[PDB]
């Protein structure tokens, strides 16, 4: 009477599924996407960052962003009823509270989406490997948008939910962290690139070693959760790649566990690296390379050339990307290559 | 008496051995520079 | 320059490889 009627209404068949997980997902997901659209349409960044980042201020799709709060806010939650805005929606939109709105809602919407994957798999009666593969974007979101500012000064040093703000975030991690030299980052790059490489090779060879090309092509009945895996031959693909590459799969199960395994691991190792970079525990320098650079001043690798480029990124982007520090760098202290 | 009937054997075939040796060797090739610094 | 950084690389090479090799030559004897 109380509970099983609501449970049978939620798990009922419909256009969209809305389980017990949908009550957490759909308000949080709808409000995160809507807060991003109403922030890039109307909300400025002038009082936090000193920038114009909305369509109302005359920006395109690339240069809009719902920017991070100011550095004097710290790691404050910035609630609408909180002690900073105090119910004022104008001052809440001006102080950067829309960023914390979108970030906390994206967190609970990702929680509700992975609960939705567990619920649909608990219905269909399958193993929930999609919710295990969705553990990697959740770990990337938690390590980047939550753990990295919580280890830094405040919410100001975080990705500011735009396209060009994301490109600024990549240049900031190159300049201030030397994040390309991090081995956890390199495992992340290798996981993503091996996944895309695995994606293209697998698609290329299922579409090639098909059972019926076109000549006696009896179109058999196809079901969608087999993801069309009846239609190709394992033996022809193993015979191809044992002679081309010298190594090939002979399982349809280990091949697809490998496609599950590679970019989730890649994405989990880059999460570990950004969690280390939250405390500025980065992989900046090789110490004996610094000693060899100090020993003779005619020693130059590509790494010591990269350190001067990170020095240039730092000292030229720093008075504008961090305007709360009030950096007054004269032209004589700025690093130039002809100096 | 009974010797705790649960001791199932451990398998590790040669292709698992090759994959684990590739993982350990490229992890050492990745992290050797940072261990040597 | 680390003197004990070479030990870390040798302990990282040897210790999981000795586990995999013992596991393989112990599974070929009776699988």
């Amino acid at each position: 009477g109380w509970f099983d009627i609501l449970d049978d209404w939620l798990k009922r068949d419909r256009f969209v599924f809305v389980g017990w997980s949908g009550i957490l997902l759909f308000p949080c997901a709808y409000l995160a996407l809507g807060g991003w659209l109403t922030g890039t349409t109307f909300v400025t960044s002038w009082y936090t960052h000193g920038l114009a980042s909305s369509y109302l201020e005359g920006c395109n799709f690339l240069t809009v962003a719902v920017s991070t709060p100011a550095n004097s806010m710290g790691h404050s939650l910035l609630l609408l009823w909180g002690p900073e805005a105090q119910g004022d929606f104008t001052r809440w939109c001006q102080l950067g509270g829309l960023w914390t709105f979108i970030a906390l809602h994206g967190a609970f919407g990702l929680i509700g989406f992975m609960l939705r994957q567990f619920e649909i798999a608990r219905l269909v009666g399958v193993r929930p490997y999609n919710a295990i593969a969705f553990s990697a974007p959740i770990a990337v979101f938690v390590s980047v948008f939550l753990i990295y500012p919580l280890g830094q000064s405040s919410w100001f040093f975080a990705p500011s939910f735009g396209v060009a703000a994301i490109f600024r975030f990549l240049l900031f991690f190159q300049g201030f962290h030397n994040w390309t030299l991090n081995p956890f980052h390199m495992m992340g790059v290798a996981g993503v690139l091996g996944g895309a490489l695995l994606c293209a090779i697998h698609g290329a060879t299922v579409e090639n070693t098909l059972f019926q090309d076109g000549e006696g092509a009896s179109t058999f009945r196809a079901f969608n959760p087999t993801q069309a895996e009846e239609t190709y031959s394992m033996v022809t693909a193993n015979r191809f790649w044992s002679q081309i590459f010298g190594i090939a799969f002979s399982n349809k199960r280990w091949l697809h566990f490998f496609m599950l395994f590679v970019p989730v691991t890649g994405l989990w190792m880059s999460a570990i690296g950004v969690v280390g970079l939250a405390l500025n525990l980065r992989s900046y320098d090789f110490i004996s390379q610094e000693i060899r650079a100090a020993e003779d001043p005619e020693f130059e690798t590509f790494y010591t050339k990269n350190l001067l480029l990170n020095e240039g990124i730092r000292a030229w982007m720093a008075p504008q990307d961090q305007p709360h520090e009030n950096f007054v760098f004269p032209e004589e202290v700025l690093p130039r290559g002809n100096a | 008496m009974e010797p705790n009937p649960n001791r199932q054997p451990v398998e590790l075939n040669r292709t698992s051995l090759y994959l684990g040796l590739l993982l350990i060797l490229v992890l050492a090739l990745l992290f050797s520079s940072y261990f040597f610094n | 320059v680390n003197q004990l950084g070479f030990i870390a690389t040798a302990l990282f090479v040897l210790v999981p490889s000795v586990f995999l090799i013992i596991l393989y030559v112990q599974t070929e004897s009776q699988q």
């Binding site: - | 075939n13 292709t15 090759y18 060797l25 090739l29 040597f36 | 070479f6």
Partner: peptide, 27 residues
Amino acid sequence: METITYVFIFACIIALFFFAIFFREPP
């Protein structure tokens, strides 16, 4: 000692490639 550790790990990787292509496990 520092260089030859890198060359030793790379040579063991090439030797693993040789043992993986030609001494592969039969089905």
